[PDB]
Amino acid sequence: MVTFHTNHGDIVIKTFDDKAPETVKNFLDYCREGFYNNTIFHRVINGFMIQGGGFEPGMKQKATKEPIKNEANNGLKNTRGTLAMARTQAPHSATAQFFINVVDNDFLNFSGESLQGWGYCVFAEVVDGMDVVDKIKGVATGRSGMHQDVPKEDVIIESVTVSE
DSSP state of 68: B
Q: CA–CA separation, 134 vs 128, rounded Å?
A: 12
Where does the chain have alpha helices with state H? 21-33, 130-136
Q: CA–CA separation, 117 vs 107, rounded Å?
A: 8
| Cα–Cα nearest to 155, from 86, 74, 84, 100 | 100
Cβ-proximal residues to 7 (8 Å cutoff; 6+ apart), any chain: 154, 155, 156, 158
Domain range holding 9?
1-164
DSSP codes joined into one string, 17-61: TTT-HHHHHHHHHHHHHTTTTTEE--EE-TTS-EEESSB-TT-PB
Dihedral (C-alpha) 46, 102, 4, 40: value to the nearest 10 degrees? -20
Buried b (16+ CB within 10 A) or exposed e, 25-42: ebbeebbeeebbeebbbb
Q: How was this model experimentally determined?
A: NMR
Contact 19, 122 (CB under 8 A): yes
Provide the 10 A C-beta neighbour count for residue 103.
12
Q: CA–CA separation, 120 vs 98, rounded Å?
A: 10
DSSP state of 91: T
Provide the 10 A C-beta neighbour count for residue 153.
13
CATH code: domain of residue 12:
2.40.100.10
Cβ-proximal residues to 120 (8 Å cutoff; 6+ apart), any chain: 70, 72, 78, 84, 85, 86, 87, 94, 108
Count how many domains the chain has: 1
Helix, coil or strand: residue 119: coil
DSSP state of 107: G
